[PDB]
């Protein structure tokens with residue numbers, strides 16, 4: 001047994017709360033774990049319209065990374081959209097990261113920019129079922145924020161999760177500011193000497209969706225991780241639908257990747 | 259007793275939000291009932307920050323607005339947990355006609371007689387200064403502490419001691435500061451009468467292992483402001499919707515059928 005320090009990063013609309021089952025499992029196993037709320041997420045004080053710049057959204061993780069003690073290194077886990085966040089962290093504090101885990105996360109790199117990963121990622125969310133957007137820059141300009149609907153969550157996100165988790169999420173999801181893919185690419189700049197220096201592990205956790213898996217496969221090709229693992233039977237929120245398997249997998253990764 | 263779709267409205271306590279009722283919300287929607295769980299001011303994902311709502315009325319407004327927008331002919335089963343007891347008491351006074359029956363789950367239940375001032379002071383004594391809870395002074399030492407922040411240990415020990423470990427983890431990621439409202443403010447905001455507030459059916463649900471609000475204190479309130487009935491849920495810690503979801507749910511449907 002070696003005490004590890006896990007740092008968990010949620011995806012769009014979510015917050016630190018979505019990892020509650022994982023956090024409980026890590027803590028009861030004696031490990032340290034930090035689940036951050038990104039800007040305007042969970043109980044972060046900012047509202048969507050107050051953080052129009054991507055850096056504002058990533059602020060919480062970046063500040064936490066900067067306060068990490070000297071010797072300490074962590075297992076940085078990014079979920080879906082959260083991959084962009086941990087990517088920025090890897091580039092900024094490479095020495096502080098033992099291993100980075102992209103749980104179905106947007107994993108941009110030199111051969112596949114944030115514009116490609118985000119355009120496709122948002123592809124399966126925008127204009128889906130009961131989702132809806134706002135227009136702060138006039139109804140004539142691109143949408144300002146994206147709000148996830150109850151139906152969308154039930155049928156596309158939590159479809160393989162306990163019903164109470166859908167209910168939990170329905171009461172907690174918050175709007176996502178629609179950051180410009182350009183703003184994003186200027187914010188997330190990766191180099192081989194830093195980002196590329198961090199051990200990287202990708203976890204495929206997609207179910208009954210070829211196109212989506214083809215997307216994940218595409219990213220893996222363009223920006224080859226150190227390892228690819230897989231979890232089966234998961235919906236979009238693995239920490240909700242396959243908690244024990246995810247925990248087991250993260251523990252394994254933390255143990256072998258010193 | 260035949261199943262008849264009703265509308266349950268859940269009101270959380272200090273530091274919490276609609277999120278704490280997730281297991282109950284799921285059970286109710288599963289059974290075919292309507293349920294609405296609200297975030298009071300600066301609670302859960304409500305936009306306001308504690309310091310921005312120093313007046314109790316701004317804490318209670320999400321509830322008051324919801325009640326007012328309630329289609330004139332529908333009634334609801336209003337459930338308030340602990341501090342949430344004051345919020346529902348207010349709604350019962352303002353919208354008695356719209357409440358089929360009110361349920362106080364370990365809830366502060368001041369009557370037309372015993373003022374919240376008295377109860378609020380007792381409730382405070384059970385949280386303020388407990389374990390790792392702390393206060394703030396955004397207005398200087400010359401003035402009263404401005405907010406109250408629940409500590410991880412206070413939660414684990416006095417509130418979630420009989421709940422699944424994952425629920426304590428969820429709470430430590432969601433609990434928010436509570437503005438320290440003055441009893442004078444609350445007392446003027448929560449004016450109850452036997453004419454309005456008194457006309458609504460009331461049930462109190464006791465949590466036998468409640469280490470947050472002691473049985474002694476809970477007992478007295480029932481003494482001073484007799485409810486139409488009192489039920490108990492054994493093995494329940496303070497967060498009954500956490501430690502004993504199924505029993506709380508069944509008890510709620512039972513109350514609903516009785517005071518239809």
Ligand SMILES: CCCCC[C@H](O)CC(=O)O
Pocket residue numbers: 011012080081106118121122123125146
């Ligand atoms: C417009 C950006 C949409 C990002 C969607 C995420 O990648 C997937 C999700 O978590 O729903």
Ligand SMILES: [Br-]
Pocket residue numbers: 271272340341470
């Ligand atoms: Br309380």
